[PDB]
Amino acid sequence: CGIWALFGSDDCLSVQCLSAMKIAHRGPDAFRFENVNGYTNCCFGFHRLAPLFGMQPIRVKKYPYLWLCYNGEIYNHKKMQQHFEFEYQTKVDGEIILHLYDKGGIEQTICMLDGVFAFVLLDTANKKVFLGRDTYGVRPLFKAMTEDGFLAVCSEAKGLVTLKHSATPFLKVEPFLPGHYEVLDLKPNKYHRDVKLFPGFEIETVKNNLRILFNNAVKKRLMTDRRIGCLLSGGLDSSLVAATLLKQLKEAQVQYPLQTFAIGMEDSPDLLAARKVADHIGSEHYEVLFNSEEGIQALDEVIFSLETYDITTVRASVGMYLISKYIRKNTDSVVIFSGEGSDELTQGYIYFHKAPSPEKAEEESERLLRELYLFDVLRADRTTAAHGLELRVPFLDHRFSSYYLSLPPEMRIPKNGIEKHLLRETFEDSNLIPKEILWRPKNSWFKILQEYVEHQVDDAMMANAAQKFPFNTPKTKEGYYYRQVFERHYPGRADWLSHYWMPK
Amino acid sequence: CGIWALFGSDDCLSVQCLSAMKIAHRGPDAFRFENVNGYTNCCFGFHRLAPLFGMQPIRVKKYPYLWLCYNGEIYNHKKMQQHFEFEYQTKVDGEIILHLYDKGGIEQTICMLDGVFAFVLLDTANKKVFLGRDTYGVRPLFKAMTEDGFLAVCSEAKGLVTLKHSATPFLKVEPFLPGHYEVLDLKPNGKVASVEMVKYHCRDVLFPGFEIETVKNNLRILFNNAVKKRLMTDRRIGCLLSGGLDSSLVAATLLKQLKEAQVQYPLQTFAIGMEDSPDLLAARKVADHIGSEHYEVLFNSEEGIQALDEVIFSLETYDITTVRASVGMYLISKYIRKNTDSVVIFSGEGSDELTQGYIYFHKAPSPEKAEEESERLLRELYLFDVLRADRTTAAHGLELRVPFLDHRFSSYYLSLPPEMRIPKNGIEKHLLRETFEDSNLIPKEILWRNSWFKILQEYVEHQVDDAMMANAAQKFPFNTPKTKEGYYYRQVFERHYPGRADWLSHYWMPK
């Protein structure tokens, strides 16, 4: 599902459609263009992931002036549909936004939606254009605004770089800040409540709350029509996500068995851990093995899709891209789960042990969560959706994450040299994951890629590098090659990334 | 209202979109692209004129696998919904076709529409593609077929020449023959093969035998019913009062039925002519008699010379009798779109040729030859007369209606014995004049009854000399231009559309 909205375009629309047919890998089944009546300059375009209804440029009979296109999914449409007695003409849940927009405006329609979305709304009655995204950064949105009044919104930045505006030579294609709603006036030519839970912060009665929130998040994420698969990396996060996923699937009476996917190098502890978790839970495990040649040949397309030039979200996105391609090739599991967003929410990184104080620990956790739409969610989203797959994060929801971050700073920090202590303790007695893998906190792929970079980039151009790439100069020979590929693909658009990756 | 289908493609679908926008002037209000699910190679496209309801690529709930895209209006839709007890999810006129296609196949969905229609239908369940056009041809449809399974259908040929197909050097864009429906097999990769193309040529929804004083009553009833049924329109209706008898009667009957139906807006006529021309005076006389809103348009020579290029680009023909009368129609249509808010025009085009209405028809060797010539020239109406009346009108977002070409009236007129249609007392179209003599629809002075081509000839002579005409025999091998005017029109047409001259075969005047 990919959206593309244009407003104020003056260089026709036939020559400006080539950008739209570049995010088409998000949904390869359907495709639709539209023009806002009376606003021929404005145009809409959608790509759908697979029979009759589902075309995103919604224009209902009750609200003829509301044109909404959203490339996400909201998990709380049933509750408000029953509670607010709202009738939906179509089968798409996103219409509820319209049924809320006429109710209390944009603040009420954006702040009462459980799920991940990125929506563009046009209201000709009051002549207003609204743009919206999620609290954390999933379902990416990118906007380009020329001073004259040009508006260009695309799910991925590949649909705006090729856009041509003759008014000004350069258009600034910037990522949309995650938690924000933008309201603009259409000329003729922060919001980061949606709601069992035991009050108090006692240690015994906090595990119940955490488990309830995690189970509710997983059950809410079950809302789909395609198959559900899980990426079984091997760590604690994805292991518990898969365990709870299959438990709810058995509870929900789902015919197809759960399908876990694990990408790894030959004879690695991570792959063995994934196999062990799959064997204990009892799912269908697919053990993808990747070599150096495929990972090297995928660097160009990984950089093209991820739209980044870092050294941490392009060194782990290769495996995710390969496993997504394998899933699309030899599996019908469209909807995919992932444990991403769980090792910074509860301070799971290696460098969180060297913490000057717990206050700085949760401050850094919040800072990392705010900048999650460029480091971790980007890798798990662009690579996944480049193969016609839909990502779901069972850990990064609005309620469980807020409760975890609202907890006392003393509980989140590791206490016995083992990270994620509270998460490990909460589900220890549930027997969801074997004690060998739930406990025991924590492959030669970086070295071979570095040796490839040494044979690709030279040594003299390394010293005289920080004038070819002035902003965010690369340091190592690997980041320089990533930046070179990014510049060859997207020229001069290096302002998307501000800082590479700063562990303390 | 412009349709566009691209069944079969290999050169992406975004570099092949400019052709779709090349015909966007038909309706400049909306424009939708669509890709058929499971057949991402084939793509649709519409350009609608004049709110929420519309978007002609219909996909009804009851027929999820049927995708229809049509240009035109089906006038007998209120007599089919009740009779065939067929519902309608959308307020679109053409949806009825889909229902009929599920009732009696394609033959029963084509020989039951008493209107004008050029439609593309796709049925992915049986993997079939259907094309179609009117019996007479007042709806434009052009098809481009490549053997590898490429079927590109556009309302005007300006939306097919730009289309690019690799693995094939030349793409043949040809007009679709009216009265034909082309069943096509859809291979499971987007390619299209041809299986059938057969002619098809509805009265179930006061008709005595043949005799004088009775045939006139039948003609009166048929013409009145045709105009009344053609009144179905959600926007303003304004007749083109050229000054001739056909347009005069059309406008008079239109005003009578509008007054009968209690329409708030007053009928407005529209005439274009040179200074103090007798045709303009006759049009003013008719407008004064019937009590209408006449907006005469005076067009100068320079405007015609400037609009020659645009009229050749739009009319898509290089005749000497078509782009010589389409200049005035184009200018008047521009005037109507600019300084008036009438979008539906009930022109009298397609009348004289139906009822023996030309100067040479006087010297007919025999009545049988006269009626055969009338039928032949009326069958070829999609290149000479209707083309000028339709392309020029639609180039400014205006719709065309031709009440004289309705199936019932024309069929009855041509079923008449030949000795009644023939000129009788040295006049043209005697029976039509007598059929409305006592109705007082049009005054007796005009019912009972040129310095434009000289500037064109002199401008062509100044532009094109005899040096080019000394080699025009080999410069244009197919349908060589004889006169200088034809030479200049052909040169402009070839500059606009290169090497596509198979559209026209003959010009005029079969003495």
Author numbering:
A (entry chain B): 1 to 50, 54 to 192, 202 to 204, 207 to 209, 220 to 466, 478 to 539
B (entry chain A): 1 to 50, 54 to 204, 206 to 209, 221 to 464, 478 to 539
Quote the paper.
Here, we use human ASNS, a Class II glutamine-dependent amidotransferase that mediates asparagine biosynthesis, as a model system to evaluate whether EM-derived maps can provide insights into conformational changes that might mediate function in multi-site enzymes. As in all other glutamine-dependent enzymes, catalytic turnover requires that ammonia must move through an intramolecular tunnel connecting the active sites. Human ASNS is also of considerable biomedical interest, having been linked to metastatic progression in breast cancer, sarcoma cell proliferation, and decreased effectiveness of clinical treatments for acute lymphoblastic leukemia.
Single-particle images of unmodified, recombinant human ASNS (apo-ASNS) were collected and processed using cryoSPARC62. Data processing (see "Methods") eventually gave rise to a map with 3.5 Å overall resolution. Moreover, Phe-31 and Phe-33 in both monomers form a hydrophobic cluster on the other face of the dimerization motif that likely contributes to the stability of the dimer interface in water. Second, the EM and X-ray structures of human ASNS both lack density for residues in two loop segments (residues 201-220 and residues 465-475) and the C-terminal tail (residues 539-560 and 536-560 in the EM and X-ray structures, respectively). In our overall EM model, Arg-142 adopts a conformation in which the side chain blocks ammonia access to the tunnel, which we therefore designated as closed. In the fifth PC (component 4), the side chain adopts a third conformation, designated as partially open. Based on these findings, we hypothesized that Arg-142 might function as a gate to the ammonia tunnel thereby regulating ammonia translocation between the glutaminase and synthetase active sites.
